[PDB]
Structure formats: C-alpha cells, structure tokens
Amino acid sequence: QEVVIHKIRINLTSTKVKQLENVSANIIKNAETFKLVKKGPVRLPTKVLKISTRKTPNGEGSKTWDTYEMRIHKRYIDLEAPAHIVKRITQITIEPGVDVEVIIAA
Amino acid sequence: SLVVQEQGSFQHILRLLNTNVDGNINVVYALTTIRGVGRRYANLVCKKADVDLHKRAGELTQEELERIVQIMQNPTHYKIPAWFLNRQKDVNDGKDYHSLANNLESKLRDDLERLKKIRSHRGIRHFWGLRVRGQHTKTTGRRRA
Amino acid sequence: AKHAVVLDQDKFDRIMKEAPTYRYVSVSVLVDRFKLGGSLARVALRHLENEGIIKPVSKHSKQAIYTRAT
Amino acid sequence: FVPVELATTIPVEIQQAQQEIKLFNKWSFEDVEVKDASLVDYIQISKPIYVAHTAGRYANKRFRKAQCPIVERLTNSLMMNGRNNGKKLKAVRIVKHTLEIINVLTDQNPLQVVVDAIINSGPREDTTRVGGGGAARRQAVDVSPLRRVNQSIALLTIGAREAAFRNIKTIAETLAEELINAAKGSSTSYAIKKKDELERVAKSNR
Amino acid sequence: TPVTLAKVIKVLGRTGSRGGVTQVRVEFLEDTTRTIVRNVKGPVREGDILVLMESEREARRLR
Amino acid sequence: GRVRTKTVKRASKALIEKYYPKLTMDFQTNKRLCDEIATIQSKRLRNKIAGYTTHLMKRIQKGPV
Amino acid sequence: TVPSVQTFGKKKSATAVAHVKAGKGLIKVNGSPITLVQPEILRFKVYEPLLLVGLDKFANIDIRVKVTGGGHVSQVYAIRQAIAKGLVAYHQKFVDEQSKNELKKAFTSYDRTLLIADSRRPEPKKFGGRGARSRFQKSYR
Amino acid sequence: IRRAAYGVVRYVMESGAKGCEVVISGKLRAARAKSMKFADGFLIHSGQPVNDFIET
Amino acid sequence: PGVSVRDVPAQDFINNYASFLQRQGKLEVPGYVDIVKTSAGNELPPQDSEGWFYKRAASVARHIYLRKQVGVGKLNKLYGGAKNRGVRPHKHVDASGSINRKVLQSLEKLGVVEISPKGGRRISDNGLRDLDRIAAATLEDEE
Amino acid sequence: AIISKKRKLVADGVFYAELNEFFTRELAEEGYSGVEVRVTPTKTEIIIRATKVQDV
RNA sequence: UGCGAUAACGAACGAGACCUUAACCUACUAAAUAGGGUUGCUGGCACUUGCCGGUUGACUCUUCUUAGAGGGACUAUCGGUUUCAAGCCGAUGGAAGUUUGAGGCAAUAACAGGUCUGUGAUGCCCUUAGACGUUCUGGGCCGCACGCGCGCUACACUGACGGAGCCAGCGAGUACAACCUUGGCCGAGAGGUCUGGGUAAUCUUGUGAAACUCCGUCGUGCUGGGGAUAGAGCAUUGUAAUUAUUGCUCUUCAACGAGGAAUUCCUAGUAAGCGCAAGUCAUCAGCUUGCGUUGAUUACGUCCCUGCCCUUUGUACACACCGC
Ligand SMILES: [Mg+2]
Ligand SMILES: [Mg+2]
Ligand SMILES: [Mg+2]
Ligand SMILES: [Mg+2]
Ligand SMILES: [Mg+2]
Ligand SMILES: [Mg+2]
Ligand SMILES: [Mg+2]
Ligand SMILES: [Mg+2]
C-alpha cells in the first residue's frame, strides 16, 4: 500500500578492507534478492591518517622516524527503495569491524 | 622614451634641504639619497609633483623643486593620509608630523633624548649601546658600535 | 661612476652617425662602445626602429637584438 | 607551399616553416658535418629536433648522453649555478638568442659555428694525478672523444658566466662571442685559453 | 701542429691508482696495423677515435 | 645484480626433474604449467621460477648439464 | 553518432584528455586554440606532432583538449602526448592501418616520448635529508 | 626461572608452534644485568611473515 | 567563421581593454590612486602609476569571463605573490583586497560584472559584448 | 556523537586500547589474554579471552 | 648472491622471497560526493549548417577519476662475451629492463652509547609538612670580549623591479565547542566585520603555491644589487607583548663584487632551485616530516685517500692499544 521511496544512502566505512568488500557483496546480494533500483557500490578515495613520530623517546642518537598510518575505506550504496525494505536490510547483514550506517534522507 | 636633445648640462649635483641631491639618476633616487626620505615616500612625492619617473631629473625645474620641498614640509595640507609618515602621534594632545632631511635627523635626536630622559627599557638599551628590539646576541653581531 | 651617462646634441649626432653599420645593435653593444648608459642606449635603439634603418631580430626585455636594413 | 585551413587559424610564417623541411626553431638544421673523426657521433647534428627541450632519459645507461642533442647539452650547461639552477626554459631562450646573434654576425649557419667552437674547445691530452709514492707527479693522458666534447661544452659556458658576472653583456651574447672566438681559433676566449694551458701541461709531462 | 688521428680496437682494462683512466690498444687511422697501448681519460668504447699530439710512446699501468 | 636466488634455482631444478615434458621453451606457457603444479604463494617468485625453468630448457636444447 | 575518441596524455602529474572528432579542423586546448599555450618556447613542442604528420590529417580530424595537474611545461608535454595519441587512435578506428603504422614510425623517428607515456614519477623525500637522496650536513669538528 | 622458561617452551611445542622463543632480561642473580634467551624450532625475524605468523 | 575571446594572446587583449577604458573615461576612480601598494608585498607602487588601474580592471573582467563565479579573496590570492619578507624565506600573502573590491564595484557599475547566486560574481551581457568587440579589434590589429 | 568518520574510528580504537589495558591490569589473577569488541546497533558485544573463565 | 672447485652432505637464520607504495591496463566491476558525450532552456558571436559558454533541466557513457578484482616483467627475444657456467655487455620490443624505482621490516653477538626530565616502567639512596612534594607571582632559559655546529638571506644583468600570463600534489580542518573558513561590505595595509558551506572526493580548494613565461622600467656605480640594524605608528593573539610574539605602513640604509686552510652532499625525475604541507600551535617558521613544480652537469670506474670487511701473518695483549 505504501511504496514510499525516501531514497536511502548506505554508508560503509572501515579499516579492514576484505571484510568491508565482503559486506558490500552481501548487501548487493540482498538487494538483488529484494529486486530494487540501486546505484552499485561506489568506492570513495581511501583517506590515510599519517602519524610521523621520532622513533626515540629521549631524542638521543641518530634522528630516525616512524610513519605509522591508518587506512580508511569509505563506500556508498544508494538505494532507490522504500523505508520498510531499508529497515529489513539494516536488520540483516551486520558484520564485525565494518561501520554500517544509513543516511535515509536522499 | 626620448633621448635628451638640446645643449643640456644643467647643473651636476643640486643642493636641497641642506643635503646633496645627486645630478642625473632620478628624482626618487635623489630623495632616497637625502638623509630621511625613502623609496615609496619618494615615489609618492614624485607623483604629487607630476613629473615622469622615467626622466633623469637633475635637469629639473626650480618650481618643481620648490613644490617637492613644500610637500616634504607639510603632510596635512596636501593629500597625504597622515598615517604614511615617519613620525605620527606626539607631544601631549595634537597632530602627526614628519621631517625629511637635517630636520629629520634633529627630530630623531630629540626622540632619542626623550627616551633617555624617560629611562624606559628601550632608552636604557640605547644608553648602553646595545640591542633595543630583543634580538639574541648569544651568537650574532659580535663587533657592535 | 665611470661616466658615459651625460646627454648632449653632439653625442646624439655621433650616435646617429650612424645606425647603418654593425651586424647587430644590442643595448650591451651600445654600452660600452662608451655610449649613453643603458636606458639611454635602449631609447636610442627604439628611435632607430622608428622609420627603417635598423630592423629587429628579437623583441625581448633586455635581450633586444637589432640589425641594419634592408 | 599549401597553407591548409585549420579552424584554429595558424600564423602564415609558422605555416610556411613546417612540413617541407625538417627545420630547427625557424631556420634549417642540415649540413654542419664536423670532418674530424672522434668528435663525429658524439657531437650529433644527425638527429633533427625542433626545440632545445626534451624529457630525455639520457642519463641512464652510459653513452646515451652522446645521442642527446648539442643545443640541449648547451642549455643544460648554462643552467649551472644555484641561482639559475633548473630553469631550463630560460636556458633555452638564451641559446636561441645566441643562435640569432650568430646568424646576424657574418650570415653563416649558427649550429655549424657552435659545432666548430665545440671542436676547438676539446682538449687533446689532459693530465691526471697519480700517487707514485707520495709526490704529486702528473702523467699526461689522452682524452676520450665524448669526455673532450663535454669539457668543451663546460668551458664555453664557464667563460660566458664569467663574462656575465657584473656586466651588460647578456649571458647569451657572451656565449655567442665565445663561440665566434672558438670558430676563429683566436685564443681570446676563456675555453680556448684553458685548452691551450692543458696542452702545455701535457707537453711538460711527456 | 703535427696531430695523429688514432682509433680504438680493444679496451685493455681500467687503470690508474684511482679510477679515471683506461688502458686502450690503438690502431691509428692513417697507416694502419701498428698497435700501441695508450691511456685514455674519459668514457671509452670500441671504434672510438683519439686525437693526440705525441703518438709513438707506449704507456703502462700507473702506480 | 640479477642473480636468481638459490631457492628459486632449486625449485626450477625440481620442476625439471619432475616434468621435463610439459615445459616448452616459451615463457608464458611454462609459467602457467608451474602455477598448475607447485604451490607458489607469491606471483613474482612464480614468474622468476618460470624464467629459470625456461633458461634451463634452453640450456638443455644446447646439450646436457 | 559521429566518429570520435577520447585520448589521454600524461607527464609527471600533468594530465590531458584530448577529444578527437570529425569536422572542419579544430585543435583546441582548454577552449583556447592550439596557437597560444603560453609557455611560448614550447608552443613549438605542442605543434610538433602535427608538423610531423602534416596539416592534411587535421582537415578531417577535430581535437579539443582539457588539461589538469602538473606545472606549465609538464602540462604542455601532456597535451602534446594527448595530441600524438589522438590522431593515431582515430586512424586505428576509422582509417587505413597503413597510415597509422606510418604515423607510428614517424613518431619513433622523432620520439620525444609522444606515444610512449613518460615513465618517471618523483622519489619520496625520505627523512634525514632535504631531498630524496641528498642528506643534511654532518660535522665532526 | 630457566626451568620455568623451558617448561613454557615445552608447553608451546605441545600446543603446536613451529617454533617459539622466550627472553628474560634483568638481574637474574648478581647486580649486573643479563639477558637470558630460551628458544625452540624456527623463528622468522624479518619480513611480513612476522605480523601474520609470530604472536609477540 | 566565428570570432571568440580566447583567440587573442591575453596580454594584448588586456592592453586593448585598457585602451578602450581610457577612451571611455567612465570606469570611475577609487580614490587611492598612487597612494596604494597593490599588494602587501611589492616594495614599490605601480610603475605605470596613472592608468594601471584600468588594466587591472580589464584583467579582472577577463578572469571573471573565464571562470564560472569569482569573488574578492580568490582574486587577491590570484594577484599576490612573494614578499621579500627579509632574511626570512618567502611566504605567499594575498594582494590588495580593498583595491580588488573597488575594481569589482567599478565593473558592476559599468555593466561588465553581474552578481551571481551561491557566491561571488559572473558576467553581464553588455560586458560580454564589449569583450567580444575588443577581441575582434585585437584580431584585426594582428591581421 | 556525530564526528568526522576517521576521528570517530580513532576514538573507538583508543577506547579499545584502554579497555585492553584495563583488562591486563585487573584480570591478572584470571589470566586474561585479549578482548574482542563488536559494535552493533543498541547492544555492544565485549568478548573476553581468559584462561580462568569461571573466575572471570 | 650464485657458479664452480671440494671431508664434506643436506639444512636454518640474516640477504633474497615478503609487504607497502610508485609506475601500465580504450580488458572487467562503479559513480548527480569523479569526469565526460548528446540534447533542453539559455549568453554572446560570425551571422548558413558553425565556435565558445552557463545551467546538476533530461538521456546515456567510464577514456581520464577513484578503487575493487585480476593480469603484466621473467633480464623477455636476438646478437656477441664468459670453463659456451654463474652471470655480465649491446640492440629489439615493451608502461616498466638500475634488485623496475622508493622504502617497511631486518640475524648472531654485543656497547658499561642515550634515556631513571615519555612513562602509577622501576632497584636502592636522598629527601619527606616553613619540603627536593605541590602550588601561586615575577623573572630566567633569549644575557655578550669571543669560539665552533646545523640553517636562512645575499653578493644581481641566467638580474632587479613593475605589470600581465598563470599551472601542482601531499594534506588538514569544529557542536560543546569555537576548526578550516569561501561569498558580501569597510580598511593602502595587516586586519575587521556581517553572512555562509563544511564532521568533509561534496565546503575551505582547481588550496588558480611559488620558482617560471610575456611586454616594459634600471643598465655592469656597495647601484633601483643586498637587506641588516634602527625610529615611529597601525593591526592581531592572549590575563600579560618592554627583554620589538607575529603581521602591516612609512622612514634607515650596515656588512657582503662568489669567500683562505679545510670539509659536506650527491649518480636520475635524482642534484640544485622553487614553493606548498602538516607537526608543534592561543600567538609565532629561517626548523621538521612529507608533497609536488622546475629540472641539469659528470661517472657508471678504482682501490690513491677515508672508513669498513675478510685472508695470511706476528703478539709478553684478553678490563683486549685508552692494552701491556
Ligand atoms: Mg627470512
Ligand atoms: Mg628483508
Ligand atoms: Mg628576493
Ligand atoms: Mg644470450
Ligand atoms: Mg626494492
Ligand atoms: Mg576537492
Ligand atoms: Mg641602496
Ligand atoms: Mg622548530
């Protein structure tokens, strides 16, 4: 009766990459099963967090450095689909590590 | 633009404001050479006068020179914003002013004297013959006045 | 100062006599053949390019290479 | 011959100086044959390039520096000194100016003149310091063609730089003058003088 | 100036107390088939040509 | 210094011992064969091994070793 | 509908995208014509491929380029590369192969990269030094 | 301490490690500091096979 | 055929525009002319002095035409360069902002620049026409 | 709540680290090894790996 | 590192492999948070059909973009050279033929190297309630006859100054705070203000960065090179700016015409130049980790020096030449 499409973006942010990919795949599969209009898994530029730190505590000896870094992986799945469907999706397909998140408002 | 035709040779080295205005060269440059006028200020003065900066201007006119002198003398009478100056804001409740020659030197001396009288940190430093504006003499400038 | 900056009618005349001759006229060339200094030389060159006499090769700022007609 | 109409209109002179002849910047790149074995193959006018500027992966193997054009080499040499370091465009411009000057002077091909100058500048025999117990005895040694060429290139550039230092004589002009001197083996130039000195040294230690 | 135009048949090892000199066997251009081992300063290769003043004087490995 | 490492060499030798036929001179094919056969974790390493095998084959083609 | 290709060109971080089409004979760059560019000495370089080919090939083909990244020289180089590509691509698509081959040969003969993309990207400026390989300055006095 | 280390190593082996290593550092008797190393099997020090394989 | 703004080699176009402005005598003066630096790093006011302003205005107009929508800060950034800051190395500090603003205002008054939505300014029709005319003139001169 | 994604992630990591540290400190008698944090909606699952599970 | 020769055989660690990144993909999977094509409306042109535009109006694409999955280089093919071995050298193709470039990790044994001023890491000693604990307040680390050490700025004409042209990549950036902050007006500036946009491929930001390129002004004079010390005012950060925090405005114009004995760094997108960038940060960049832009000269060798490594030698040394 409703069939009210709010236009819903699923964000998918993570560090672990393979896991994220798997999650995305799962989501896609779910969508296919439910048979909806959606834009495919858009992948955004991998933001890298860099922390340069002198390896030493005491600053004595040669001046050596360690670039410790964090990889951020950010994906978007845009669903032209209802509210109920979105809710259902949210309910099923949750894995550890990946930050599942929904915008909901076009 | 144009090569100086005609006989020429109109006075090498002019004397202005008790100081030596150099012949040929350029008006701005001459001003700079005077003890108290700088580059931008000189340019401004030239603009006010209405002479070309291209001209060498040791063959300058007398009227022009007079005008320049007047300009130097007076900030407030002519269109000079009065925060473009050497000195500004001085004595008790009053006006901004600057000199540009011998006069400028005198003014500077007076200021120094005042500072000395005050015995402020800066004044003290000046008296000593030292570093007023807190620059580190641990390494640098090992000779001094 | 090394002189060669003072301006005269006679000097001008000698400069003129003449644009003809010289494979190339370059401010540098002009000074020092002991002629009027830099700016003056440039001005002279410019003048020479008014009505024939010396035609150009380059046109750049300070690298101004000119040569006799025709 | 045959100015074809492209929508983006090209100047007439430019159109003329294209296609038919494989020219340099404006004028022709042909002739210039050295006629001095050693300096053939390592002074390369055989390769016709249109500007003294390439990406140029020349510094890679060993002898690819040979096949790099002469004008380019000159430009590179000019690019010396920190104040002027990098700035290849400027160098190119200077080179162009020099070429123009050369053209102006006694007509003649500028490239040819340059080549001649280079040839003049290469020292035949140079000394190299040997240990030999302790003292500074210097054995005279023959110079390899490429090396000689390089030296020549250097020397002229150095001379030009010297001329420039506190001077009207725009570096390009100085360079041109040097080249001219080399061509008419005068020993008024700096590079030539250096070469002569080297020769003398060699003679002394033989 | 009597100059001899020489040509490189074989590079006979890198020489000198230091690096920058090479022993080279040389068949000169005019009047061929008279081999001399002479020292060359720069980058050398087979078929390179040498300009030199003092020809008939064979060199040795520098100490 | 493109000296193919010891382990790689050993692997190549082993391959040769095993499957002298099914190792045709050309490279891609050899690589494929290697992949089919032995459990190389890396790609680069595998490629190297293949190359070595090819070299060995070539050598053989000019008499034994 | 019309026959067209998008050929990219590159140098360091400079990037160019040349749209080749059929038509009268535009060779445009960022809207402006081929003639400007405006490093001015390397205008010639930009021309160079065209010159090599001959003006006849552009009577049909219409190139319009968009350029980003790099500095000026790099950008120019990228543009040139794109230009070189584009004609070749067109030939491959819609013209005889022989012509294309000839073009390639010509490029090789006067190879200032052109078809081959330039290999070199800059080195990381690793610590203990102001450049990549260069170090600071030791003193043991 | 040494005995304990040995025991630990044995336990590890039993559990099924390819190899293990224990370092015990400090004043194991006497004032002067000593390091004491106790190991069994293989121990990959270099490369990425360290984060993947060796628990520290 | 088709006459365009881009076909002209920039500097020449700018010069032409300046000339046109001069001829008009109706771009309007700011009030700071030759009592102004033009950038926060430039140890010498404009050498042209009288004029110069017109040229600047023309340049600004051209920039506006080129781009989608431009403002004051951006313009300043474009204009400014290196301070010979002293014995210290060079920073990049932006040019005279007030001057730029004044120029923009003048342009608006003329009917070169038009106020845009989102932010900044774009181009008017009359201004565009003028630009085109200038370009044409330049082309003619070249010919 | 509501921060830059990267920043949020960093914060989470820090929290995890803190938790781990706490566990190390506190569950010494219990023989704690490591934590596993699963942040689902509503509930958050903090799994603990220790030897003496009963004790924990 | 291998090939070989061999009372040694087969092995492990270290190196390599590995990993990350830097390069190729008109071959896949993708996108109004990346870019284009047609077309709508629409601005200007020439005025024929054509040229540049502006609009997230439509429709469609994935080359560039990103970034997932894969391939791709193995010294490949050919030539010599080498006991026709390991390999090396040159041409060809190829995005790539320097271990493809760059790093990340990186053995055994150690050093009385540094750090108990990162540490609720800590032995012992000291101290231990007018503390050597804490905490306020004012200074000080910045003082100057003078040594050396990183550095920046210059000794100009390959420049300076004006205009004009005008192009990067790493990044970073706030809701309990006060972050980046476009766009509009005021101000010569600095900087103020109103307004936004951004928790960020969306907004700052195309960070239209410089060095560069073009036309003009000074022409080789301690000059307009050079910018120090100086005086004054205008700004900002903070509770507090004198012992100028920093910025800006005018003024002052010093030393220095490429630097002796010495000695550093460097082999390709390197060197050098040039700026940006975050780090620290209320405010301060001459510093630093990165980034890109411009982009060379000369080797592509050798043991002369320097260091280090081994081998054979000699040893009254073993806390080991600062030895005995
Ligand atoms: Mg290993
Ligand atoms: Mg390793
Ligand atoms: Mg400067
Ligand atoms: Mg072979
Ligand atoms: Mg590597
Ligand atoms: Mg952006
Ligand atoms: Mg001065
Ligand atoms: Mg610092």
Q: What would you measure as the largest C-alpha separation in chain G, in angstroms?
A: 76
| Centroid of ligand 5 to alpha carbon of A93 (angstroms) | 41
**Strand K lies under 7 A from the Cβ of residue I54:** no
- Residue A44 and residue A99 in contact, taking contact as beta carbons nearer than 8 Å: no
Residue G36 in contact with partner chain I when CB distance is under 8 A: yes
Smallest CA–C1' distance to K205, residue: I74
> Can you tell me whether residue D14 is helix, strand or coil?
helix
Joined together, the tokens standing for residue H16 give 């099924």
Residue D189 carries which side chain, given as an amino acid letter? S
Query: Are B48 and B118 part of one and the same domain?
Result: no
| Centroid of ligand 3 to alpha carbon of F21 (angstroms) | 74
Instruction: Tell me, rounded to whole angstroms, the distance of Cα D62 from its chain centroid.
Output: 20
Residue to mutate among A23, A44, A99, A103, with most J CBs inside 10 A, is: A99
- On the 0-12 / 13-18 / 19+ scale of CB atoms within 10 A, D201 is middle
- Residue G9 and residue G16 in contact, taking contact as beta carbons nearer than 8 Å: yes
Question: From CA D10, how far away is CA H8, in angstroms rounded?
Answer: 85
Residues 21-80 of chain B sitting with CB below 7 angstroms of strand K: 25-26, 29, 32, 34-42, 53-54, 56
Query: Are B95 and B74 part of one and the same domain?
Result: no
Q: Is the dihedral of CA D86, D89, D93, D96 positive or negative?
A: positive
- Which residue in the block uniquely carries the two structure tokens 């603990």? J48
Minimum distance, in Å, between the CA of residue I91 and any CA atom of chain B: 22
Residue A47 carries which side chain, given as an amino acid letter? K
Cis omega (within 30 of 0) on the bond before D125?
A: no
- Fold adopted by G1-141: Ribosomal Protein S5; domain 2 (3.30.230)
Query: Are B33 and B66 part of one and the same domain?
Result: yes
| CB-proximal positions of chain K, under 7 Å | 1-4, 11-19, 21-26, 29-33, 35-38, 43-47, 50-56, 63-69, 71-77, 84-91, 93, 95-110, 112-115, 117-119, 142-176, 181-192, 196, 199-201, 204-206, 208-221, 223-224, 226-234, 242-245, 247-253, 257-258, 264-276, 279, 285-304
Query: Are B65 and B87 part of one and the same domain?
Result: no
Is I90 annotated as a binding-site member? yes
Task: Enumerate residues 41 to 70 of chain A having a beta carbon within 8 A of any beta carbon in chain G.
Answer: 62-65
- What CATH number is attached to the domain comprising J44? 3.30.300.20
Question: How many domains, in total, are found in chain J?
Answer: 1
- On the 0-12 / 13-18 / 19+ scale of CB atoms within 10 A, J5 is middle
Cβ-proximal residues to B42 (8 Å cutoff; 6+ apart), any chain = B27, B28, B29, B31, B32
Which helix (H) or strand (E) segment holds residue A102: the answer is: strand A99-102
Question: From CA G117, how far away is CA G101, in angstroms rounded?
Answer: 18
* Structural domain containing residue B102: 82-145
Question: How many domains, in total, are found in chain B?
Answer: 2
> Can you tell me whether residue D18 is helix, strand or coil?
coil
Residue B4 in contact with partner chain C when CB distance is under 8 A: yes
Residue D72 carries which side chain, given as an amino acid letter? E
Question: From CA A65, how far away is CA C16, in angstroms rounded?
Answer: 70
Residues pairing with D59 in the sheet? none
Question: From CA G34, how far away is CA G51, in angstroms rounded?
Answer: 12
From the list D137, E45, E28, D144, the residue with the least C-alpha distance to E37 is E28
Q: In what order do the strands lie in the sheet with G32-33?
A: G5-11, G14-22, G61-68, G27-29, G32-33
Residue D67 in contact with partner chain E when CB distance is under 8 A: no
Q: How many CA atoms lie within 13 A of G84 on its CB side?
A: 26
C-alpha distances (whole Å) from D8 to each of G59, G77, I120 are 11, 20, 33
> Can you tell me whether residue A69 is helix, strand or coil?
strand
Which helix (H) or strand (E) segment holds residue E40: the answer is: strand E35-40
Q: Which CATH number fits domain D1-206: 3.40.120.10, 3.40.462.10, 1.10.455.10, 3.30.2030.30?
A: 1.10.455.10
Minimum distance, in Å, between the CA of residue D123 and any CA atom of chain E: 9
Question: From CA C54, how far away is CA D101, in angstroms rounded?
Answer: 15
Contact between G38 and I6 using a beta-carbon 8 Å cutoff: no
> Can you tell me whether residue B40 is helix, strand or coil?
helix
Question: From CA D27, how far away is CA D17, in angstroms rounded?
Answer: 8
Which helix (H) or strand (E) segment holds residue G43: the answer is: helix G43-53
> Can you tell me whether residue D202 is helix, strand or coil?
helix
For E25, which DSSP code?
A: E
- Which residue in the block uniquely carries the two structure tokens 């010891």? F6
For D31, which DSSP code?
A: -
Question: From CA G24, how far away is CA D105, in angstroms rounded?
Answer: 44
Q: Is H44 left (phi over 0), alpha (psi -120 to 50) or beta?
A: beta
C-alpha distances (whole Å) from I65 to each of F15, F55, I122 are 70, 65, 7
Joined together, the tokens standing for residue G44 give 């010639």
**Strand K lies under 7 A from the Cβ of residue D138:** no
Which helix (H) or strand (E) segment holds residue G22: the answer is: strand G14-22
Q: Are strands D125-129 and G27-29 parallel, antiparallel or unpaired?
A: unpaired
* Structural domain containing residue F51: 1-61
Cβ-proximal residues to J27 (8 Å cutoff; 6+ apart), any chain = J48, J50, J56
**Strand K lies under 7 A from the Cβ of residue A39:** yes
> Can you tell me whether residue J26 is helix, strand or coil?
helix
- I9 chain-G contacts, CB cut-off 8 A: 36, 38
Cis omega (within 30 of 0) on the bond before C32?
A: yes
E-only strand ranges, A15-64 = 37-54
Cβ-proximal residues to D42 (8 Å cutoff; 6+ apart), any chain = D66, D145, D146, D149
How many angstroms separate the CA of D132 from the C1' of K298?
26
Question: From CA A54, how far away is CA A61, in angstroms rounded?
Answer: 11
Residues 86-125 of chain D sitting with CB below 7 angstroms of strand K: 86-91, 93-94
Phi, psi of C29 (to 5 degrees): -60, -45
Question: From CA B54, how far away is CA B3, in angstroms rounded?
Answer: 11
Question: From CA D10, how far away is CA G37, in angstroms rounded?
Answer: 13
Phi, psi of B43 (to 5 degrees): -60, -45
- Residue D115 and residue D29 in contact, taking contact as beta carbons nearer than 8 Å: no
Q: What number of H helices and E strands is found in chain I?
A: 5, 2
Q: Is E45 left (phi over 0), alpha (psi -120 to 50) or beta?
A: beta
Q: Is G100 left (phi over 0), alpha (psi -120 to 50) or beta?
A: alpha
Question: From CA D158, how far away is CA D76, in angstroms rounded?
Answer: 12
Question: From CA G68, how far away is CA G74, in angstroms rounded?
Answer: 10
Q: In what order do the strands lie in the sheet with D125-129?
A: D125-129, D138-142, E35-40, E21-27, E4-15, E49-52
C-alpha distances (whole Å) from G4 to each of B93, B116, D46, D189, G20 are 79, 83, 38, 58, 5
Cα of first residue to Cα of last residue in chain F, in angstroms, is 24
- Which residue in the block uniquely carries the two structure tokens 């101004």? C64
CATH number of A1-106: 3.30.70.600
CATH number of E1-63: 2.40.50.140
Cβ-proximal residues to G17 (8 Å cutoff; 6+ apart), any chain = G6, G7, G8, G9, G65, G66, G67, G82
Q: Is the dihedral of CA G94, G98, G101, G103 positive or negative?
A: negative
* Structural domain containing residue J5: 1-56
From the list A84, A71, A85, A77, the residue with the least C-alpha distance to A103 is A77
Q: How many CB atoms lie within 10 A of CB E25?
A: 13
- Residue G22 and residue G60 in contact, taking contact as beta carbons nearer than 8 Å: yes
**Strand K lies under 7 A from the Cβ of residue D84:** yes
Cβ-proximal residues to I133 (8 Å cutoff; 6+ apart), any chain = none
- Residue E16 and residue D141 in contact, taking contact as beta carbons nearer than 8 Å: no
Question: From CA B127, how far away is CA B134, in angstroms rounded?
Answer: 15
Phi, psi of J6 (to 5 degrees): -55, -45
Question: From CA G8, how far away is CA G26, in angstroms rounded?
Answer: 17
- Residue D42 and residue D66 in contact, taking contact as beta carbons nearer than 8 Å: yes
E-only strand ranges, D62-173 = 125-129, 138-142
How many angstroms separate the CA of I79 from the C1' of K208?
10
Cis omega (within 30 of 0) on the bond before C18?
A: yes
Cβ-proximal residues to D101 (8 Å cutoff; 6+ apart), any chain = C24, C65, D172, D173, D176
Question: From CA I39, how far away is CA I42, in angstroms rounded?
Answer: 6
Which helix (H) or strand (E) segment holds residue J38: the answer is: strand J32-39
How many angstroms separate the CA of B119 from the C1' of K237?
29
Residue to mutate among D139, D144, D198, D201, with most E CBs inside 10 A, is: D144
- Residue G65 and residue G18 in contact, taking contact as beta carbons nearer than 8 Å: yes
Cβ-proximal residues to G118 (8 Å cutoff; 6+ apart), any chain = D55, G10, G11, G12, G77, G81
Residues pairing with H38 in the sheet? H22
Question: From CA G88, how far away is CA I55, in angstroms rounded?
Answer: 43
Question: How many domains, in total, are found in chain C?
Answer: 1
Residue C7 in contact with partner chain D when CB distance is under 8 A: no
Question: From CA D33, how far away is CA H37, in angstroms rounded?
Answer: 76
Joined together, the tokens standing for residue G14 give 């400079």
> Can you tell me whether residue D94 is helix, strand or coil?
helix
Phi, psi of H25 (to 5 degrees): -120, 140
Cis omega (within 30 of 0) on the bond before G108?
A: no
Question: From CA D32, how far away is CA D69, in angstroms rounded?
Answer: 13
- Residue D99 and residue D91 in contact, taking contact as beta carbons nearer than 8 Å: no
- Which residue in the block uniquely carries the two structure tokens 């390009």? D172
Question: From CA G115, how far away is CA G141, in angstroms rounded?
Answer: 54
Query: Quick one: which ligand is closest to I43's CA?
Result: 3
* Structural domain containing residue C5: 1-70
- On the 0-12 / 13-18 / 19+ scale of CB atoms within 10 A, A50 is exposed
Experimental method: cryo-EM
Question: How many domains, in total, are found in chain F?
Answer: 1
Which helix (H) or strand (E) segment holds residue J32: the answer is: strand J32-39
Residues 109-128 of chain B sitting with CB below 7 angstroms of strand K: 111, 115, 121-122, 125-126, 128
Q: How many CB atoms lie within 10 A of CB G25?
A: 19
> Can you tell me whether residue G6 is helix, strand or coil?
strand
Minimum distance, in Å, between the CA of residue E24 and any CA atom of chain D: 10
Task: Give the orientation angle of helix D70-78 with respect to helix D145-164, to 10 degrees.
Answer: 40
- Residue B67 and residue B49 in contact, taking contact as beta carbons nearer than 8 Å: yes
- What CATH number is attached to the domain comprising C60? 1.10.10.10
Query: Are B86 and B101 part of one and the same domain?
Result: yes
Helix residue spans in chain G (DSSP H): 43-53, 73-94, 97-109
Residues constituting chain E: 63
C-alpha distances (whole Å) from B126 to each of B113, B115, D91 are 10, 9, 51
- Which residue in the block uniquely carries the two structure tokens 């390039």? D49
> Per residue in F11-50, is it b (16+ CB within 10 Å) or e — as a string?
bbeebbeeeeeebeeeeeebbebbeeeeebeeeeebebbb
> Can you tell me whether residue A1 is helix, strand or coil?
coil
